[PDB]
Amino acid sequence: MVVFNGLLKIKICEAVSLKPTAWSLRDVGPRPQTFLLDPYIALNVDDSRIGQTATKQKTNSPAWHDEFVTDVCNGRKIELAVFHDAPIGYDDFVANCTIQFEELLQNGSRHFEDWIDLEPEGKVYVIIDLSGSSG
Ligand SMILES: [Mg+2]
């Protein structure tokens, strides 16, 4: 089990090697070119959206350095989901990663900082601090 009860502070610093999905690519060269996303990361705790970073224009290695602080009640996990900001309609899912509060609370806890692998591709650097208790 293991849940978190307290304040969660997370800084979504930057991502690298983001890969455009076939859908985001649907829109014809006509020359071998690299498609650049307009990415942002959505922060979800359990199944609730906490917020999202700003959208960066034309880059697959965005640097947001956006910080979020939220009160967590019986928190199970954090999900970071990268999206491509579409001009019209729903944004396109790009990649994601999930972090269980249980792994963050392992002896010592309170402060985590490192690169987290995104699925299918890429990685995001985050700084996570917890101020509460496990249970
Ligand atoms: Mg939008």
Q: Where exactly are the structural domains of the chain?
A: 1-135
DSSP per-residue string spanning the chain: ---EEEEEEEEEEEEES----HHHH----SS-------EEEEEEETTEEEEEPPPPSS-SS-EEEEEEEEEEEEE-EEEEEEEE--SSSSPEEEEEEEEEHHHHTSTT-SEEEEEEE-BSS-EEEEEEEEEEEE-
Residue 7 makes CB contacts below 8 A (sequence gap 6+) with 69, 70, 71, 72, 130, 131, 132
- Report how far apart, in Å, the C-alpha atoms of 75 and of each of 3, 29, 46 are: 5, 45, 6
Residue 29 makes CB contacts below 8 A (sequence gap 6+) with none
Q: Is 53 exposed, middle or buried (0-12, 13-18, 19+ CB in 10 A)?
A: buried
In CATH terms, 1-135 corresponds, of 3.90.120.10, 3.40.50.300, 2.60.260.20, 2.60.40.150, to: 2.60.40.150
Start-to-end CA distance of the chain, whole Å, equals 8
Give the Å distance between the CA of 55 and the centre of ligand 1.
Answer: 8
58/60 Cα distance (integer angstroms) = 7
Give the Å distance between the CA of 109 and the centre of ligand 1.
Answer: 35
| Burial annotation 82-112 (CB, 10 A radius, 16+ → b, else e) | bbbeeeeeebbebbbbebebeebbeeebeeb
Q: Which two tokens stand for residue 51?
A: 């917020």
Q: How many CA atoms lie within 13 A of 101 on its CB side?
A: 27
Give the Å distance between the CA of 73 and the centre of ligand 1.
Answer: 29
- Report how far apart, in Å, the C-alpha atoms of 127 and of each of 22, 35, 69, 106 are: 31, 29, 12, 16
Give the Å distance between the CA of 108 and the centre of ligand 1.
Answer: 39
Name the structure determination technique: X-ray
Beta pairing, strands 92-100 & 111-117: unpaired
17/97 Cα distance (integer angstroms) = 14
Cβ of 24: how many Cβ atoms within 10 Å? 19
Ligand 1 being an ion, which residues bring their Cβ within 5 A of it?
A: 85
Give the Å distance between the CA of 59 and the centre of ligand 1.
Answer: 16
